[PDB]
Structures are given as C-alpha cells and as structure tokens.
Design goal:
Distance between the termini of chain A: 18 Å
Organism of A, B: Acidithiobacillus caldus (strain SM-1)
Oligomer: part of a larger assembly
Radius of gyration of chain A: 19 Å
Strand content of chain A: 35-45%
Entry title: Cryo-EM structure of the Type II secretion system protein from Acidithiobacillus caldus
Keywords: Type II secretion system protein, Acidithiobacillus caldus, toxin
Chains A, B: Type II and III secretion system protein
PDB class: toxin
Chain lengths: ~45, ~50
C-alpha cells in the first residue's frame, strides 16, 4: 500500500538446475540461465 | 511386478522466429503564413449640450 519496507534484488550470473536421469543416462532437466548488469541509462533518482 | 520408467523421453522441437519491420516518413512545411484577423476602423462622438 501507501504512496516502509526494504527488499534486496539479485543481479549478475544466476543458474538453477533440476536434473533427472534414466537407466541409459538420458537427462531430463529444467535449467534457468540469467545474466544481468546494472544499466545507468534507465536508472531513476526518486 | 512390472515398474514404469522414471520419465518418458519426449521429442525436441526447434523454433525459428523472424520479425521484420520497415518504417518510412516524409514531412513538408512550405509557404507564407499571413495574419487573418486585423483591427478595423473606429469612430467616436462626444458633446456637451449643456
């Protein structure tokens, strides 16, 4: 609401990995890959 | 006594997407821009009879 709490946001290189393996070593997986950097062009001042 | 597999090997799909856009524009502003509203004539009268 309103118009206080402080939160922290991650940035940089991030990986998440959830593998699953079969008897033939087949891999079923979900992977998240994120690369982010701070951009001065779109930063505001409040 | 038979057991299932941990998972089924699905088929993999490749997706190729193309987005194309072209924009063109022209802008012209030429000529002479005169006034269209000007003051007109005036007349006044005043007198004291007494």
């Amino acid at each position: 609401a309103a118009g206080q709490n402080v939160t922290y946001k991650d940035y940089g290189i991030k990986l998440e990995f959830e593998p699953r393996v079969d008897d033939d070593n087949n891999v079923s997986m979900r992977v998240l890959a994120d690369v982010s950097d701070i951009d001065p062009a779109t930063s505001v001042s409040l | 006594l038979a057991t299932p597999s941990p998972f089924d090997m699905e088929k993999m799909v490749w997706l190729d997407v193309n987005i194309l856009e072209i924009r063109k524009s022209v802008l012209e502003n030429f000529g002479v821009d005169w006034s269209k509203q000007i003051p007109g004539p005036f007349a006044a009268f005043g007198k004291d009879f007494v």
